[PDB]
Design a protein around this ligand. Sequence first.
Ligand SMILES: C[S@@+](CC[C@H](N)C(=O)[O-])C[C@H]1O[C@@H](n2cnc3c(N)ncnc32)[C@H](O)[C@@H]1O
Ligand SMILES: [Cl-]
Ligand SMILES: [Mg+2]
Ligand code: NA
Ligand SMILES: [Zn+2]
Ligand SMILES: [Zn+2]
Lengths: 300, 129
Amino acid sequence: SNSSQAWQPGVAMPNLYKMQRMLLEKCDLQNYGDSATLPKGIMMNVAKYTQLCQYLNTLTLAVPYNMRVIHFGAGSDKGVAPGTAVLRQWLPTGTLLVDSDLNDFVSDADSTLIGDCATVHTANKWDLIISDMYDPKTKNVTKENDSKEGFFTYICGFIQQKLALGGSVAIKITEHSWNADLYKLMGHFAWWTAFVTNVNASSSEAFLIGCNYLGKPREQIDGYVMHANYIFWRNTNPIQLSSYSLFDMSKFPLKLRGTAVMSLKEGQINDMILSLLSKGRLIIRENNRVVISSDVLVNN
Amino acid sequence: STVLSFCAFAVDAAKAYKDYLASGGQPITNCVKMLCTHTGTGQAITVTPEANMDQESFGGASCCLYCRCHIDHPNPKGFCDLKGKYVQIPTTCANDPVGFTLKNTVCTVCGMWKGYGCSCDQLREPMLQ
RNA sequence: AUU
Ligand SMILES: C[S@@+](CC[C@H](N)C(=O)[O-])C[C@H]1O[C@@H](n2cnc3c(N)ncnc32)[C@H](O)[C@@H]1O
Ligand SMILES: [Cl-]
Ligand SMILES: [Mg+2]
Ligand code: NA
Ligand SMILES: [Zn+2]
Ligand SMILES: [Zn+2]
């Protein structure tokens, strides 16, 4: 429990951990389940999304005008969307925000889709993907900690087909809620990390953050080894629960960079374009009418 | 034609909640309170949290009776003036944001709550250099 | 995972 990390919004996995070849084993946190002291009347997920956004502000996110953001797992047992309200607060005004969840809920997003994420279809590319999806049956550990293939297979497909080059992602994982292919896809970004919010340091939860999608593998990552590396980091680096970053919101809003959006063919992507994508200075996708929908199963 | 006739006579969700509160009923919970500096303009409904030191900022949709109860909004277009925005509630009333938005109206001139920030009806101030 |  390092005190220097307590004034940060959270802790990012050090690069040295990513270069190891660890064997998977149980995640055993010295402070498991402990609750942080939240500001009066602030929900855990408002605090958690606020710290995620505070960390995303320090990265090279592309922020174009008419930015397109999709938020998966935005619902809650409360029937409201705390995370979506924080994303809305964080994102520049005019940012297109669509959220989704298996269960109905009241949202501040421009549009809300109800149903399994596998039923969500779009003809458009997105600039930022946020996922807080977590399968309730993950709590029923019926076998070994293998790579999970429910909503994670959908997210991997969505990243490879619906994420604009230069786009970024923040996907929630835990010791048991993880996918080997998603870690492999972190190698398709200019940079990536596993970020732990300080308000939930007592959980194996982390956000796999992919910064600036390159549409191709910059590095070859073995997902089974990288998750073992993530658990090794969590097991040997206790993180002190802290809500200190929540008390200073003066630099919270994501700065509207007005990042250029261009529709280049795959035959035009070269070293200069890849270099611009890698610095958060370029988004590559068309700018057609945003079309999204959720399938409904028809039956008597 | 005869549905709007029945709706205009009995389904007045707004008054039902006011009576429910007067009956001792617990206010609608899980209104999403936002973290902010509390050094904002203090206006009623804004595109981003604008709470001053005497207010709390909440996600609009979570503070809308019509959104929360899954009922049509009381206006032809069925438009919501809270969803996608942030409502500033006086801290003294932050325990019931849904009830506060129903029982109060925004000043069309300054954009502040009437009786809680609007100073459009105060006496003429002597000019200041 | 929805302190
Ligand atoms: C921890 S809750 C999300 C909390 C939310 N992010 C908030 O701001 O409070 C996890 C959510 O993932 C959703 N989920 C799980 N599997 C899903 C799937 N296949 N498709 C869509 N949503 C899914 C659940 O319905 C649940 O609402
Ligand atoms: Cl600890
Ligand atoms: Mg926790
Ligand atoms: Na905003
Ligand atoms: Zn509403
Ligand atoms: Zn006024």
